[PDB]
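Lecture 7, part B: from sequences to assemblies.

Below are the input chains for today's worked example.
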Amino acid sequence: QPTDLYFDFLCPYAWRGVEMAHVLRGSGEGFRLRHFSLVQGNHPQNKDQETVQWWLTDQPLGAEGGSGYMKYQRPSLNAFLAAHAAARQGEEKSWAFALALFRLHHEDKRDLDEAAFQDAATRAGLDLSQWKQDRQDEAGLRRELRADLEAAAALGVFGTPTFDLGGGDVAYFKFEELTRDPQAARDLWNLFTSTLRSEARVATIRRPVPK
Amino acid sequence: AQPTDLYFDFLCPYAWRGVEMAHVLRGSGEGFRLRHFSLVQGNHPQNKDQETVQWWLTDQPLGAEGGSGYMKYQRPSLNAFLAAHAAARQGEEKSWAFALALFRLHHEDKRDLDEAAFQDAATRAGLDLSQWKQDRQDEAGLRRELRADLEAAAALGVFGTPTFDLGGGDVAYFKFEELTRDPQAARDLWNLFTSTLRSEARVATIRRPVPK
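Predicted structure of the full complex, as structure tokens:
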């Protein structure tokens, strides 16, 4: 019934998608937060592979990823696991945490680090002792994240934000402008769903990048 | 008002569907200009991830074969494009009639884009065959017309067909699966496209993944 929304905290377009969806959820439109890792999805070992060969959830939590294809390995893995921990406090706390962290990173330009996770938890009103205890369940949070990454791979998710409407209608939705106004957010969502439900079976609308 | 520019390649059935849609919309007053983008050129290894184009379809010999892989579509597509330019020298209506006839030969009849198909499309389009013959001897002029299309497409960043340039900086690739000829269905589909590109949210991409 809710639309599944795959996101990565790294990604400002995913931030805007989650902001849109949050305001729409205010009006009764159901959305469910799920994770897709850009580091894993774009990883050279996973390129042109029937089956995922390299998992973000196999990497040590404190490991430095380098400056190449894994440069954002550590912040995105840690952000994902903190968000799973927050989501154990229910849907409303999960949205509060995910939005707060997104905003710290993309509006306030803070790194996805421990200080940012802590500020997101207090901005979200989390029970901090419970959040702390859930974060100690690293293996369990990794299993949850791995399940999200598997569901994403089964759909062929390639970027964020990607919305699964159900019924086999799934699409990446990239837009530039932050849209929190309720009326504008509803217009934008209506454009998207209209495009996916058209009996013309629209697959792609995509602007090129000019010279 | 200026027509929408429609970049297509005869090889491509999504471009075919885009041209079929646009022809129906032109029937209600929506303006469209037919232009050419080469998928062979756009996907050529020498052009991959280049600031500037390094290999031009219009630089190639007319009987040259491109060779293995996608390059085998070099000679049909170049030759198809040139015949279309010669057809377009007989006016817009004859150009649409020729483009549609050739598209339908290739995608409905499954005929190769070869000389027999060009001749057949020219007769189906009702061209003046003698003027068409004479224009096809202006190989230099046709190559230069095609190069102008290809450079215009490169300046916009065109990467695939069909790509629609609405003017005002709103340009997008538009890929849809179902042949759409009904006037109302075509108008609704087109309103979807233009609404997406004119939204104040600055939508850049809506794109379905490919399930495993």
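Note for the exam: The CA atoms of residues 93 and 124 of chain A lie 6 Å apart. Keep this in mind when comparing with the next example.
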